[PDB]
Write a protein that binds this ligand. Sequence first.
Ligand SMILES: COC(=O)c1c(O)cc(O)c(Cl)c1CCc1ccccc1Cc1ccccc1
Length: 214
Amino acid sequence: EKFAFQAEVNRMMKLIINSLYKNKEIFLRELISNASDALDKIRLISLTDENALAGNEELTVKIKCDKEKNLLHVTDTGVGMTREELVKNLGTIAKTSEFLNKMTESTSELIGQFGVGFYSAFLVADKVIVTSKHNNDTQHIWESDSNEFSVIADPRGNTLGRGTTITLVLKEEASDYLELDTIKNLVKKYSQFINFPIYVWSSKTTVWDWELMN
Ligand SMILES: COC(=O)c1c(O)cc(O)c(Cl)c1CCc1ccccc1Cc1ccccc1
């Protein structure tokens, strides 16, 4: 159930952490961007398939601060990932070569062009948990502290309907990202060219609910 990252992913994770240690907020730009791509990908599957949206009828992004448990959740209802997509999409690249030399040679711009912005999560996270439910497979969980990862069947069953949650066990330097004021400012900033509604679980004067940001 446990796996090793491949060499280039280790190299790029290190490259990412030492380039963007100053612009740490980009991690949340890249999680929202990756969520939009996933929703896009299911919207197009649904063009040639009316069962595509069966698992869950909406196309959203819901973001959650849980500051007692030191966690940040970015859940989308996009195309999701089968168990094998968790293993190769997240532990592999292949589909790079010169990128490792063209990134060493502003790389904040260029991380998103190769779609590799997921690893920017380790800038702020000690653990990343990816819970994903794909129409062609059961819900699975991917877990890593960057020194390895594992995928396991989710014992809670299919909670997502379809889609993906990124869960970040935040570092102590990233405790700032647990206050709604900061989070909603960074989400508002990075959600404007996103074609899906993006919500944060927020507080109003007191009850909790999804608050729309775009
Ligand atoms: C299917 O995507 C997710 O579930 C997902 C997601 O829904 C949110 C995320 O933050 C991330 Cl990181 C993923 C993983 C996706 C991924 C990460 C690294 C390399 C490849 C891919 C595949 C891909 C292809 C087209 C459009 C979106 C995603």
